[PDB]
Design a protein around this ligand. Structure first.
Ligand SMILES: CCCCCCCCCCCO[C@@H]1O[C@H](CO)[C@@H](O[C@H]2O[C@H](CO)[C@@H](O)[C@H](O)[C@H]2O)[C@H](O)[C@H]1O
Lengths: 95, 92, 160, 297, 427
C-alpha cells in the first residue's frame, strides 16, 4: 500500500517529465519512468492478488524494450544529420 | 528459496567493495556514427530480454514437458528469425 | 520494514525527481539507472525476486545503455540550450503533474487489501510454469512483437 | 539456499573484506608475473564503478562444504538466483567503461571505449546462452547446487561439452586485446580481477570446482584449478593478442552464440522428454570427437 | 485460424524477402491478407476461443474491415522495400489480436504490435513525414503509458487483467478512465485526437488510408470490450463531434480535413458504445471503411505527400467514375439517404437514444448537419473547372476498386437488409 502511493507519485513525476523536457530523448525517458511506476504498482497488486501481476510486469518490461528499440531508432533516424534534438523544431504540420 | 539474510549480505558486500573502490581512487590521489554501435547495442537489449525469458524455462523445464519445450522452442525461433533478419541485412 | 522502506522510497522519489529535473542527459539517464537499482531492491523486498534481477539486467543494464549510446552518439546535455523556454508552462506542467498525482491518490484511498499472498519470492522456478503455460499465448505474441520491432528498427535506419 | 547455513552479518562483512583484499593482492601478483614474463563527475565516478562491480561477484563462488571456513562459510554470499547475479554485476563494469569513454571528451577515446564496451557486452552475453544448457540439467541457478550436482552426477562439461567450449572460448577471448595515468591502472586492475574471477568460474561451473572425487580437500582444489586457467590467461596476456573485433564479433555471434543456444535446445529437448541424462554424455563425447578430430586434420 | 495465416505469412516473409523480389513479396502479403480474410468468411459464426484469444462476431467483423484496409493499402504501394509490406502484415496481425481479446496485457502487446510498424510507415522520408512519425510516436508512447497504468489499476481494483472482471468502486472507475485514455487516443476521440491531423497530413497517403480505416476499426473493436461508462462516453462524444466538424471547416488541405472528419466520426461511432450494440457499430464501420477507403484511394491517385482541396476539382471530367464514386463517398460520409452511411449513423444514433442520451445525441445531430458544409465542398467540387492538378489515372486495379466499393455503398443504402441481418453473431 505504502508502495502503491509511491508508484502514483512516480507516474506523476514522469508526466511532469514529459511536459517539461525540451528534447525528444528525455521526453521518451520520462515516459520510461512512467512505465516503471506502472510496473511497481503491478508488483504491489500482484502481492495482493497472487503473482500473475509479476508475469504481467515482466511482459511489460519486454514490451517497453521493444518500443525503446523502435523509438530510439526513430529519434536517431530523424535527427542524425539534422541539428539540435529539441522536439519543437518540427512544427510544420499545423491544425 | 533463499533466506532473505543473504540479500542483505549481498548489499553489505557491495558496501565493502565500494568503500575499497573509493580507497583506490584516493590512491589515485597519491555520418554512420550511430548505425553500427546502435544496431549492435539494440540487439544486446533484445538478447537480454530473450534470456530473461529463457531462464524461467531452464529451471522448471522437465516439469513443463514437451509442450513447455515446444513453447520455448517457438519463442526462440521467432526471435532468431529477427536476428537472422538483421544478420542477413548486414551490420556494418 | 518502515526503517529501510522510508529510505528506499525516499530514494526512489528523489531519483525520479532527478531524472525529470537534471539538465544533463547523461546525468539524467544515470540517475534513472540508480532508480532501477533501488527499484530492483524494492522488488526483492516485495517477494518479486526474479523480476528484480531482470530489472537490473534488462532495464538498468541494457535499455538505458542504449539510451546512453544514443545520446552520446548524437549529443547529450548540449541539446538543451536552445532557450525556447515556455516557462509559463513549468508551473502548468507542475500543476498538471500534481493533479495526475492527486487523482491517483484519491482512487487508491480507502483500499483495504490483503497484501498477504504466499507469492514465494518471485523465483523463475515458480514463474516458469505460468509463463510457458497459462501465459504462453501472450509470451509468443510478445516474441512476435520483438521480431516485428527489430525489423522496424532496422528498416527505420538503413542507410544507403 | 535451503540446506545452506547463514553466517552472522559481521562475519559476512569481514569475509567480504578479506575477499576483496585477497583479490587485490592476487591482481598485484598477477601483474608482477606478466611483467617479469615480458623480460568531471564521470571521470572520477566511472573507474569507481568498474572496480566496484568487478570486485562484486567473486563471493558467490563456494570454496568448500559448509562449516569449513573455520566454523563458517567459504563463500561470502550464496543467493538463490546465483547465475543472474554474475550477469548483473558484469554489465555495470562495462557501464563504467563506455562512461569513461564519454568522459575524456576526445573522439576515439569515446569511440574506442564503445568498441571495447560493446565487445565485452557481446561475449559476456554469450556466456549466458552458454550457461543455460547446464542449468537445464542442474535445474537450479545457485552455484552450490551446480557444484554439488557435479559432485554426485559429475563434472558438467561431460554433459554440456559444447556449452563448455563456448564458455571457455568466449571468457578467454575477453582477455584478448583490441589524469590518464591512474585511470588506465584502475581499469586494468578491474579487468584482471574479472579475469581471475573467470579463472575461478570456469572450474566452478563446467568442471567440479573444488569437490574432487579424490582427496576432497576444500580450498586447495579450487585454488589449483584457478591457478590453471589463470596461467592460461596470463599466457594470453603476455604474448599480447589480436582479434580486431570485426572478425571477433562475426565469429562470436555467427558461430559461438547460435551454437550455444542451439545446444541449449538440444539439452532442452532431452530434459523435457526426460529420456536419460546419458544422451548428453554421448552427444558431448561425439561433439568433442568432431570439434577436436577436425582440428587435428 | 486467421491468426495462423497471419503469423505464418509474417514470419515467413521476413526472411523469404531476402530471397524474393519486392514485387513477389507484395504478391505474397496480398495473398496472405486475402487468405486470412477468406478464412474469416468461411468461419463466419464459428466463435473460436483459445487462450486470452477469442474470435467472436466482433473480432470477425472488425478484423474483416481491418484486413480490407490492409489489402487496399498494400495494393497502391509498388515502391520496393519489402519491409514496406512486411510491416503492414505485422500491423495487420497486431490489429487482429487487438480486436480478439479482453486480456488487458495481451491487448497492450497488440497495440504495440500494430502501432510500432505504423510509426515506421509514416516515412515517405519526407521532412513532414518524419515529423508525423515523431509526433505519433511520442504521443503514442505516452498514451501507452496511461493504458498500462490503467491495466495495473484494473488489476488493482480486481484480481484480473481480463475485461469482464466484476469491478469495484473508485479504483475501478479510475482504471477504466486510464484505459479510455489510451484506447481513445488510438481511435482519435477528443481530447486525445491531436496527433490525427498532423499524422494524416504528414504520412504518405496510402499509409494514411491504412490508418484511418483499419486502425480506427480495431480501436473501436477494443472499445466495445471496455465497460465504457455513460459520463466519459458523453464527454468523448461531445468533444470529438464538435472539434471534429468545426475544426474541419477551417481546413484548406484535403487529408487534414479528412482527419478532422475522422475525429467527428469517431464521435458518432462512440454513441453505439452507449448500449455497446456492436451490430450498429459494425455496420457503421462497414460504411465508413468503404467510403473512407474510397476517398483515400482517390486522394492517393492525386498526390501521396499532400493534397490541396483545389486538386479535387475537375475530377469528373478526368475520370467520370472516380468523380461519381468520390461524390457518393462524400454523401455516405455525410449520412444522407439513401446511402449506407446514413444507415450507420442512424444505427448509432438509435443506440444513443435507446440508451436515453438525448442532449448528447441532439448535439451530435446539429453538428452533423454542420458537417454538410465540407462533405459537399468535396463531392460537388468534383464537377468544378479543373485547376492544373496532378493525376495518375490508375490501373484497372484501383478504378474497379473505387468503383465497386463505391457501388456497394448505395447498394447497402437501398438494401441494408442484405448485410445487417448478420453483422451479429453470424446467423
Ligand atoms: C509468430 C506470431 C505470433 C502470434 C501469437 C501466437 C501464439 C499461439 C500460442 C498459443 C499457446 O498459448 C496458450 O494456449 C492455451 C490454450 O489455447 C492456454 O490455456 C488456457 O486456455 C484453455 C482453453 O480455454 C483453458 O483450458 C486453460 O485452462 C487455459 O489455461 C494458455 O493460456 C495459453 O497461454
Amino acid at each position: 500500500m505504502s508502495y502503491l502511493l509511491t508508484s502514483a507519485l512516480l507516474f506523476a513525476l514522469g508526466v511532469y517529465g514529459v511536459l517539461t523536457r525540451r528534447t525528444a530523448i528525455l521526453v521518451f525517458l520520462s515516459i520510461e519512468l512512467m512505465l516503471n511506476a506502472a510496473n511497481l504498482s503491478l508488483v504491489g497488486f500482484a502481492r495482493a492478488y497472487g503473482l500473475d501481476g509479476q508475469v504481467a510486469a515482466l511482459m511489460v518490461i519486454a514490451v517497453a524494450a521493444a518500443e525503446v528499440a523502435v523509438g530510439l531508432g526513430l529519434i536517431v533516424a530523424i535527427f542524425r544529420h539534422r541539428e539540435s534534438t529539441a522536439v519543437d523544431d518540427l512544427s510544420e504540420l499545423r491544425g | 528459496m533463499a533466506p532473505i539474510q543473504e540479500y542483505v549480505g549481498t548489499l553489505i558486500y557491495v558496501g565493502v567493495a565500494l568503500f575499497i573502490g573509493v580507497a583506490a581512487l584516493l590512491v589515485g590521489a597519491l555520418k554512420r556514427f550511430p548505425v553500427h554501435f546502435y544496431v549492435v547495442a539494440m540487439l544486446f537489449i533484445l538478447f537480454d530480454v530473450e534470456v530473461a525469458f529463457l531462464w524461467p524455462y531452464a529451471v522448471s523445464a522437465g516439469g513443463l514437458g514437451l509442450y513447455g519445450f515446444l513453447g520455448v522452442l517457438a519463442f526462440t525461433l521467432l526471435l532468431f528469425v529477427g536476428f537472422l533478419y538483421e544478420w542477413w541485412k548486414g551490420v556494418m | 520494514m518502515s526503517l529501510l522502506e522510508g529510505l528506499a522510497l525516499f530514494l526512489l522519489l528523489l531519483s525520479g525527481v532527478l531524472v525529470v529535473t537534471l539538465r544533463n542527459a547523461i546525468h539524467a539517464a544515470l540517475a534513472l539507472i540508480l532508480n532501477f537499482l533501488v527499484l530492483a531492491g524494492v522488488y526483492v523486498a516485495l517477494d518479486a525476486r526474479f523480476l528484480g534481477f531482470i530489472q537490473v539486467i534488462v532495464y538498468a543494464g541494457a535499455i538505458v545503455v542504449l539510451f546512453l549510446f544514443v545520446i552520446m552518439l548524437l549529443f547529450a546535455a548540449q541539446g538543451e540550450i536552445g532557450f525556447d523556454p515556455l516557462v509559463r508552462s513549468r508551473p502548468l506542467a507542475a500543476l498538471l503533474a500534481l493533479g495526475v498525482a492527486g487523482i491517483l491518490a484519491a482512487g487508491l484511498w480507502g483500499l483495504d487489501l490483503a497484501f498477504t499472498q504466499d507469492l514465494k519470492g518471485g523465483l523463475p522456478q515458480a514463474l516458469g510454469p505460468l509463463l510457458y503455460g497459462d501465459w504462453l499465448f501472450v509470451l509468443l505474441a510478445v516474441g512476435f512483437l520483438l521480431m516485428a520491432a527489430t525489423v522496424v528498427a532496422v528498416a527505420l535506419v538503413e542507410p544507403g | 539456499t535451503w540446506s545452506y547455513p547463514v553466517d552472522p552479518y559481521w562475519m559476512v562483512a569481514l569475509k567480504a573484506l578479506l575477499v576483496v583484499v585477497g583479490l587485490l593482492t592476487a591482481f598485484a601478483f598477477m601483474t608482477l608475473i606478466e611483467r617479469r614474463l615480458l623480460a568531471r563527475f564521470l571521470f572520477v565516478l566511472a573507474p569507481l564503478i568498474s572496480v566496484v562491480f568487478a570486485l562484486l561477484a567473486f563471493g558467490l563462488i563456494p570454496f568448500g562444504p559448509p562449516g569449513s571456513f573455520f566454523g563458517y562459510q567459504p563463500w561470502v554470499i550464496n543467493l538463490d538466483l546465483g547465475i543472474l547475479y554474475l550477469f548483473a554485476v558484469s554489465e555495470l563494469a562495462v557501464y563504467g567503461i563506455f562512461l569513461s569513454g564519454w568522459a575524456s571528451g576526445s573522439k576515439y577515446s569515446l569511440l574506442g571505449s564503445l568498441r571495447s564496451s560493446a565487445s565485452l557486452i557481446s561475449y559476456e552475453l554469450g556466456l549466458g546462452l552458454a550457461l543455460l544448457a547446464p542449468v537445464l540439467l542442474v535445474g537450479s541457478l545457485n552455484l552450490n547446487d551446480i557444484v554439488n550436482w557435479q559432485k554426485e552426477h559429475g563434472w558438467l562439461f561431460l554433459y554440456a561439452f559444447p556449452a563448455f567450449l563456448v564458455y571457455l572460448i568466449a571468457s578467454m577471448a575477453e582477455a584478448a586485446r583490441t589524469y590518464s595515468s591512474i585511470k588506465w591502472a584502475l581499469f586494468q586492475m578491474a579487468e584482471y580481477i574479472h579475469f581471475i574471477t573467470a579463472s575461478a568460474l570456469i572450474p566452478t561451473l563446467f568442471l567440479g570446482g573444488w569437490t574432487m572425487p579424490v582427496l576432497e580437500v576444500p580450498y586447495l582444489w579450487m585454488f589449483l584449478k584457478i591457478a590453471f586457467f589463470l596461467f592460461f590467461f596470463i599466457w594470453i596476456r603476455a604474448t599480447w593478442f589480436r582479434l580486431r573485433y570485426d572478425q571477433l564479433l562475426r565469429f562470436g555471434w555467427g558461430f559461438l552464440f547460435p551454437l550455444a543456444l542451439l545446444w541449449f535446445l538440444v539439452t532442452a529437448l532431452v530434459v523435457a522428454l526426460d529420456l536419460p541424462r546419458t544422451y548428453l554424455l554421448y552427444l558431448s563425447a561425439l561433439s568433442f570427437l568432431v570439434l577436436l578430430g577436425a582440428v587435428l586434420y | 485460424m486467421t491468426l495462423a495465416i497471419l503469423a505464418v505469412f509474417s514470419v515467413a516473409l521476413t526472411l523469404l524477402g531476402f530471397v524474393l523480389p519486392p514485387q513477389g513479396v507484395k504478391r505474397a502479403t496480398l495473398l496472405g491478407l486475402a487468405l486470412a480474410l477468406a478464412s474469416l468468411l468461411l468461419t463466419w459464426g464459428k466463435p473460436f476461443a483459445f487462450g486470452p484469444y477469442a474470435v467472436d462476431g466482433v473480432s470477425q467483423v472488425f478484423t474483416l474491415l481491418a484486413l480490407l484496409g490492409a489489402l487496399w493499402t498494400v495494393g497502391l504501394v509498388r515502391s520496393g522495400r519489402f519491409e514496406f509490406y512486411l510491416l503492414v502484415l505485422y500491423a495487420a496481425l497486431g490489429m487482429h489480436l487487438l480486436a480478439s481479446t479482453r486480456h488487458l496485457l495481451l491487448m497492450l502487446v497488440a497495440l504495440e504490435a500494430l502501432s510500432l510498424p505504423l510509426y515506421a510507415l509514416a516515412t515517405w522520408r519526407r521532412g513532414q513525414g518524419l515529423e508525423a512519425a515523431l509526433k505519433y510516436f511520442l504521443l503514442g508512447a505516452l498514451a501507452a503509458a496511461f493504458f498500462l497504468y490503467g491495466a495495473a489499476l484494473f488489476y488493482g481494483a480486481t484480481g484480473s487483467l481480463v475485461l469482464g472482471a466484476p469491478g469495484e468502486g473508485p479504483l475501478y472507475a479510475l482504471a477504466l478512465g486510464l484505459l479510455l485514455v489510451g484506447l481513445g487516443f488510438k481511435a482519435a476521440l477528443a481530447p486525445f485526437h491531436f496527433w490525427t491531423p498532423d499524422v494524416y497530413q504528414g504520412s504518405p497517403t496510402p499509409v494514411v488510408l491504412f490508418m484511418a480505416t483499419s486502425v480506427k476499426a480495431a480501436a473501436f473493436a477494443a472499445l466495445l470490450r471496455v465497460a465504457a461508462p455513460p459520463e466519459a462516453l458523453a464527454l468523448l462524444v461531445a468533444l470529438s463531434v464538435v472539434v471534429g466538424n468545426l475544426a474541419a471547416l477551417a481546413q484548406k488541405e484535403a487529408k487534414r480535413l479528412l482527419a478532422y472528419s475522422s475525429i467527428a466520426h469517431a464521435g458518432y461511432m462512440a454513441l453505439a458504445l452507449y448500449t455497446g450494440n456492436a451490430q450498429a457499430l459494425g455496420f457503421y464501420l462497414l460504411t465508413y471503411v468503404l467510403a473512407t477507403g474510397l476517398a483515400f484511394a482517390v486522394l492517393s491517385q492525386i498526390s501521396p505527400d499532400r493534397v490541396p482541396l483545389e486538386a479535387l476539382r475537375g475530377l469528373y471530367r478526368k475520370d467520370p467514375l472516380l468523380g461519381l464514386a468520390f461524390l457518393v463517398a462524400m454523401l455516405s460520409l455525410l449520412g444522407l439517404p439513401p446511402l449506407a452511411g446514413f444507415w450507420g449513423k442512424y444505427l448509432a444514433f438509435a443506440e444513443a437514444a435507446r440508451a436515453g442520451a438525448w442532449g448528447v445525441l441532439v448535439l451530435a445531430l446539429v453538428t452533423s448537419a454542420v458537417s454538410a458544409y465540407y462533405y459537399l465542398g468535396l463531392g460537388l467540387a468534383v464537377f468544378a473547372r479543373p485547376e492544373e492538378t496532378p493525376f495518375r489515372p490508375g490501373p484497372p486495379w484501383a478504378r474497379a476498386a473505387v468503383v465497386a466499393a463505391g457501388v456497394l455503398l448505395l447498394a447497402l443504402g437501398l438494401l441494408p437488409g442484405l448485410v445487417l441481418p448478420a453483422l451479429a453473431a453470424g446467423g
